[PDB]
Amino acid sequence: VADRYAVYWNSSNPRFQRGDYHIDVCINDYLDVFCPHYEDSVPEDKTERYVLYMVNFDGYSACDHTSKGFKRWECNRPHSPNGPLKFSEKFQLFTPFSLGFEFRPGREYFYISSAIPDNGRRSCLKLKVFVRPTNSCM
Ligand SMILES: *[C@@H]1O[C@H](CO)[C@@H](O[C@@H]2O[C@H](CO)[C@@H](O[C@@H]3O[C@H](CO)[C@@H](O)[C@H](O)[C@H]3NC(C)=O)[C@H](O)[C@H]2NC(C)=O)[C@H](O)[C@H]1NC(C)=O
């Protein structure tokens, strides 16, 4: 957890349950988000699915995924064949591709999700990521 940070994005995770999950990372580190994953023996009704978004602080604060940001990943395979669906975020300064994001050191970024079956629409799981300043990373 000094290059790759594992984040299990589901409501049974106490860190998300508490509603203030936050992590510090260094440029070039990776954030690996693991979508909810279940055994076939699971009741659907109890299968979590989410869309994950990156928003600004106000959107993060208000669980607003409609006003501004980007849809980043879709946790839509609760029974994915080889382990949970996993999305990776690399905190890099430059990206040569258009499907990517570039980060700046000494800045915080925000992520929130909306339930896919769209339930109780109001509260949300969320995550704050602070990219430490260059140097404050040894
Ligand atoms: C909801 O979030 C939970 C909170 O973490 C998930 O539980 C964690 O599952 C992890 C993966 O199965 C376990 O971590 C380790 O992951 C590495 C990476 O592949 C494995 O090698 C390890 O074997 C595995 N176990 C360890 C730590 O050695 C965690 O142990 C486990 N943590 C907790 C808090 O129980 C749930 O899976 C997730 N639930 C749903 C519905 O997806």
Curated annotation (Swiss-Prot):
<dbReference type="GO" id="GO:0045499">
    <property type="term" value="F:chemorepellent activity"/>
</dbReference>
<dbReference type="GO" id="GO:0051893">
    <property type="term" value="P:regulation of focal adhesion assembly"/>
</dbReference>
<dbReference type="GO" id="GO:0048668">
    <property type="term" value="P:collateral sprouting"/>
</dbReference>
<dbReference type="GO" id="GO:0051965">
    <property type="term" value="P:positive regulation of synapse assembly"/>
</dbReference>
<dbReference type="GO" id="GO:0005604">
    <property type="term" value="C:basement membrane"/>
</dbReference>
<comment type="similarity">
    <text>Belongs to the ephrin family.</text>
</comment>
<dbReference type="GO" id="GO:0070507">
    <property type="term" value="P:regulation of microtubule cytoskeleton organization"/>
</dbReference>
<dbReference type="GO" id="GO:0098982">
    <property type="term" value="C:GABA-ergic synapse"/>
</dbReference>
<dbReference type="GO" id="GO:0071944">
    <property type="term" value="C:cell periphery"/>
</dbReference>
<feature type="disulfide bond">
    <location>
        <begin position="63"/>
        <end position="124"/>
    </location>
</feature>
<dbReference type="GO" id="GO:0043087">
    <property type="term" value="P:regulation of GTPase activity"/>
</dbReference>
<feature type="glycosylation site" description="N-linked (GlcNAc...) asparagine">
    <location>
        <position position="10"/>
    </location>
</feature>
<dbReference type="GO" id="GO:0061178">
    <property type="term" value="P:regulation of insulin secretion involved in cellular response to glucose stimulus"/>
</dbReference>
<dbReference type="GO" id="GO:0005886">
    <property type="term" value="C:plasma membrane"/>
</dbReference>
<keyword id="KW-0449">Lipoprotein</keyword>
<dbReference type="GO" id="GO:0005169">
    <property type="term" value="F:neurotrophin TRKB receptor binding"/>
</dbReference>
<keyword id="KW-1015">Disulfide bond</keyword>
<dbReference type="GO" id="GO:0022407">
    <property type="term" value="P:regulation of cell-cell adhesion"/>
</dbReference>
<dbReference type="GO" id="GO:1904322">
    <property type="term" value="P:cellular response to forskolin"/>
</dbReference>
<keyword id="KW-0524">Neurogenesis</keyword>
<keyword id="KW-0472">Membrane</keyword>
<dbReference type="GO" id="GO:0048013">
    <property type="term" value="P:ephrin receptor signaling pathway"/>
</dbReference>
<dbReference type="GO" id="GO:0005901">
    <property type="term" value="C:caveola"/>
</dbReference>
<comment type="function">
    <text>Cell surface GPI-bound ligand for Eph receptors, a family of receptor tyrosine kinases which are crucial for migration, repulsion and adhesion during neuronal, vascular and epithelial development. Binds promiscuously Eph receptors residing on adjacent cells, leading to contact-dependent bidirectional signaling into neighboring cells. The signaling pathway downstream of the receptor is referred to as forward signaling while the signaling pathway downstream of the ephrin ligand is referred to as reverse signaling.</text>
</comment>
<protein>
    <recommendedName>
        <fullName>Ephrin-A5</fullName>
    </recommendedName>
</protein>
<feature type="glycosylation site" description="N-linked (GlcNAc...) asparagine; atypical">
    <location>
        <position position="135"/>
    </location>
</feature>
<keyword id="KW-0217">Developmental protein</keyword>
<keyword id="KW-0732">Signal</keyword>
<dbReference type="GO" id="GO:0009897">
    <property type="term" value="C:external side of plasma membrane"/>
</dbReference>
<feature type="disulfide bond">
    <location>
        <begin position="35"/>
        <end position="75"/>
    </location>
</feature>
<comment type="subunit">
    <text>Binds to the receptor tyrosine kinases EPHA2, EPHA3 and EPHB1. Forms a ternary EFNA5-EPHA3-ADAM10 complex mediating EFNA5 extracellular domain shedding by ADAM10 which regulates the EFNA5-EPHA3 complex internalization and function. Binds to EPHB2. Interacts with EPHA8; activates EPHA8.</text>
</comment>
<dbReference type="GO" id="GO:0007411">
    <property type="term" value="P:axon guidance"/>
</dbReference>
<keyword id="KW-1003">Cell membrane</keyword>
<feature type="domain" description="Ephrin RBD">
    <location>
        <begin position="2"/>
        <end position="135"/>
    </location>
</feature>
<dbReference type="GO" id="GO:0032956">
    <property type="term" value="P:regulation of actin cytoskeleton organization"/>
</dbReference>
<keyword id="KW-0336">GPI-anchor</keyword>
<keyword id="KW-0221">Differentiation</keyword>
<dbReference type="GO" id="GO:0046875">
    <property type="term" value="F:ephrin receptor binding"/>
</dbReference>
<dbReference type="GO" id="GO:0048672">
    <property type="term" value="P:positive regulation of collateral sprouting"/>
</dbReference>
<dbReference type="GO" id="GO:0099560">
    <property type="term" value="P:synaptic membrane adhesion"/>
</dbReference>
<dbReference type="GO" id="GO:0050731">
    <property type="term" value="P:positive regulation of peptidyl-tyrosine phosphorylation"/>
</dbReference>
<dbReference type="GO" id="GO:1900025">
    <property type="term" value="P:negative regulation of substrate adhesion-dependent cell spreading"/>
</dbReference>
